Structures are given as C-alpha cells and as structure tokens.
C-alpha cells in the first residue's frame, strides 16, 4: 500500500462510427466569422406536365417556380472542466498528460450521443414493430428495399445495429448450405460481411436509448393542418392537433415517437405512384420533435418532422396519395412506456456535421488536442489564490438536416 505503479490501469471504451458515416463534405469551413450563426443550402426543383391534343395553345395554365432552403446551425458547448490542487495532481502526474486520455474520449462520446439523439429525433421513416428484435435476414434487407423503393439513387446507404443483434445474424449465417468462405468466417470470427442484404451493416455499442412515454385512447385529428409547399418549403416540419386522447397526463408524447397515419400512403417520389409492400400498402409516418403534454379534453398540439405535402395548386411537390383532413384515424407505434435502444438506417445525404474552431483566449495559456479529426481547445488558469487551478476543454459542433425523408428507425417484425 506504499509502492504504486505509474501506469494507469486500462478502462472501458466506446466506439465512433456515426460521425464517420455521416456527411462531412458539404458543410466544412462554411460557418466562418462572415457567414453568421446559420447557413443555408438550396433544394431541387420538380415539374408537372399537361395532357391536351392541340398545338396552337400558347396560352394556358403554366407551372410555377418555388425555391426551397435547408438551414444548418450551431449547437451548445461540449465543456469539461476540473478544479483541483496542483500539488496533489503533480505528486504523480507531471504536465497533466494523464488526465488527457479519459477527457477527449468523454468529449467525443458525448458528441456522438448528441448526434444519435438528433438523427433519431429528425428521422421520418419507420419500419417494423419496436418490440421485436432483429433475428433474420429480411429484417435488415427490408431497409435497403424500402430505400430503393422510395427512389434515392445518388449517395450510399448505411445501417447501424447493437452487438447482440449482429451475433444473431452471424449465428444464422453459420447455418448456410454452400458458401464455405462465409460459413468458416462466421464460425471462427463471428463477423458478418460488409454488404449484408444490399446495405452496409455496422455494429456499434454506443447508441442512444429512449423511452416511449405513456399514452392511451384512440387518437384522431381535430383540425385540418396546412401542409402546402409554400408553408413547408423551408423546414419540412408541421404542427398538428390531436383529440380523443387521455384526460390529463404529463409527458403524453416524448421526443422521437412515431405517429402513423393509417389511410395516407407513401408515394414513389419521381413517378408519383403509391407504394405496395407486397401484401399491403405502406402508410405515412412522422416523428415527434418536442415533448408534448395533454390538457383537459385530450387536446395535444404536437410538432412533427416530415410533411405530407398535398398542394392543390402545385401538384408537382406531392408526396402522399391523399390529403389528411379532420376525422382521420392515427396511431402511435410501440407500447405504452417501454425503454428501447433503436436501430438506425440512413442515406449518406441525410444529416451533416461540422465543427467551429475557437480562437485562443487572451492572456491565458492554452493548447489544442486532435482526436478523430476533432480539435479540442484547452485553457488553463489560476483564478483564486488557494492552489485552485482550473482547466477547461471546449469544442463546438454544428448540425444540419437535409431531407427528413431519407432515414429513420427500424426494428424486427413478427
């Protein structure tokens, strides 16, 4: 109890895959000191045609040109700060290079936890029932099939899952009949290949977990919402009111819950035709953005990401077969209040990420540390004359979501 080794014992580490897979190309060095507190990108255009049998018709009802935007902003500071006594610190730690190791890992872990929360809060698409886990090959093939069905072409599509589910897929792979390479690989190393079912599958232990939130009663819409393109051309979000809920409960709908509209179906975006899931048409779904409570009378005002545009003056921007109107029937996926760790699937051009460099603080010594391409700025000072040293680590992220209709959550289904 007197001799002490200098070498710190090994600890536990998470993994960093989400920041690697997300898009870091378009938004990089664009939030400068001149741009401001936000930056915007453009949106593609869409057109519709007419069907008439005559040619000298130079005067008719033409199209219209509407320009959209996608805005990306900055987030809050990721700060870790310690106060200590420099003598007890430097008994065995000179230059404070030992405290560095478990700090950058904490910073990047929190960064990816926030990124996963943001992605699962802003994703729109949903698949499978939340209860059932992933067990078979169709559970991972369906994500790529649905992504191809919607119509996304330019980009690359990825899916991320927990360690146990991969194990089950490798176990199922061990039972193959003719591929010796796959059978031997799964038998020995229990690792699944890269291209699994047409989509790149990834294994991650660091993944956010969420709670459903209590709800009860056959919900239904009350007032017809506004889902025109002139309204939703800048945010792709819309606010809707729900009636017929439970009398008065706090936290009726949490952030990330999926609300499904039964009688409004998805559309193949280019050809503007309904989608058939082999046996039954696919219904529309949206994601709750902010926590919503319920007041007396069961009125819930909720903001959803992903909009069912049915503009009647600009048909070219439709994305749903029929307009949702008052008296429709809606549901909420999952059970009452369980906690689960969802699985993600997304396109490359769904959510971006960036970092903002920070200038050195005046008359205070500082340094910069790089970790997975993220620069953390550390400042040291000695305010207070009671051997009170203070070191602070700072990093500033920036987020942007391009199109909500290119990602979401997926589970297994019975």
């Amino acid at each position: 109890s007197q001799i002490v080794l200098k070498k710190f014992l090994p600890g536990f580490m998470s993994d960093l895959v989400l920041a690697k897979t997300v898009d870091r190309q378009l938004l990089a060095g664009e939030i400068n000191s001149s741009t401001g507190d936000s930056v915007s990108f453009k949106r593609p255009h869409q057109f519709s045609s007419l069907r008439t049998p005559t040619g000298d018709i130079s005067g008719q009802n033409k199209n219209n040109l509407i320009s959209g935007k996608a805005t990306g902003r900055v987030g809050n500071y990721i700060t870790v700060a310690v106060e200590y006594q420099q003598l007890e610190e430097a008994i065995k730690l000179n230059q404070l290079e030992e405290i560095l190791a478990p700090v950058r890992q904490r910073i990047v872990t929190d960064l990816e936890t926030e990124l996963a929360h943001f992605m699962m809060n802003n994703g729109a698409l949903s698949l499978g029932s939340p209860n059932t886990p992933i067990t078979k090959w169709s559970d991972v093939a369906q994500t790529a099939s649905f992504l191809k069905d919607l119509g996304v072409n330019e980009g690359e599509n990825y899916a991320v899952m927990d360690p146990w589910s991969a194990q089950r897929l490798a176990d199922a792979q061990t039972g193959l009949h003719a591929s010796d390479q796959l059978v031997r690989t799964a038998w020995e190393n229990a690792q699944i290949p890269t291209n699994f079912g047409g989509i790149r599958a990834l294994m991650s232990n660091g993944l956010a977990s969420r709670t459903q939130g209590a709800f009860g009663g056959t919900l239904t819409v009350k007032t017809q919402p506004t889902v025109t393109y002139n309204a939703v051309k800048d945010s792709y979000q819309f606010t809707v009111t729900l009636t017929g809920a439970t009398a008065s409960v706090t936290g009726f709908l949490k952030a990330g819950d999926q609300v499904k509209f039964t009688n409004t179906y998805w559309l193949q975006q280019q050809t503007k035709q309904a989608l058939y899931n082999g046996a039954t048409p696919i219904s529309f779904t949206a994601t709750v953005t902010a926590d919503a409570n319920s007041d007396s009378g069961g009125d819930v005002t909720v903001t959803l990401s992903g909009v069912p545009i049915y503009d009647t003056t600009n048909p070219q921007y439709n994305s749903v077969s029929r307009q949702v109107e008052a008296g429709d029937a809606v549901s909420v996926v999952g059970t009452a209040s369980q906690t689960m760790k969802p699985n993600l699937f997304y396109n490359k051009f769904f959510c971006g990420l960036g970092s903002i460099p920070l200038p050195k603080l005046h008359s205070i010594d500082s340094a910069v540390a790089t970790y997975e391409g993220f620069s953390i700025r550390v400042h040291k000072y000695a305010d207070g004359d009671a051997n009170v040293q203070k070191m602070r680590f700072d990093l500033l992220p920036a987020y942007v979501c391009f199109n909500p209709h290119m990602g979401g959550q997926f589970f297994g289904n019975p």
């Binding site: 870091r24 230059q95 290079e97 500082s366 340094a367 910069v368 790089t370 391409g373």
Partner: protein, 50 residues
Amino acid sequence: PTSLDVTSMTSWEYNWFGADVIYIAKYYEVRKESVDVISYRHPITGEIAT
C-alpha cells in the same frame, strides 16, 4: 476531413499552441513477387539480353 496519426510522443513537458499540424506517414513494404522475364537473343551487339 483531416485525421492524423496519434502517438502522444511530445507535449511531454512542452506547451503547445499550433493547431495547424497533421501527422502523415509514409509506409514501406518489401514483397517477394513472381515475375516473368523475356530473353532477347539478338546476335548483333551482344547476344544474351535478359
């Protein structure tokens, strides 16, 4: 993006201020590779030419 090799070799009793350094490494390999050779046997100006 810029991802750099991490060694944590320096900063050992040293103050760092330059955030504009990225460490890139050249990697050397030696292999035994089986190559086919051609033997030109022109009689004029030396015969064997491998």
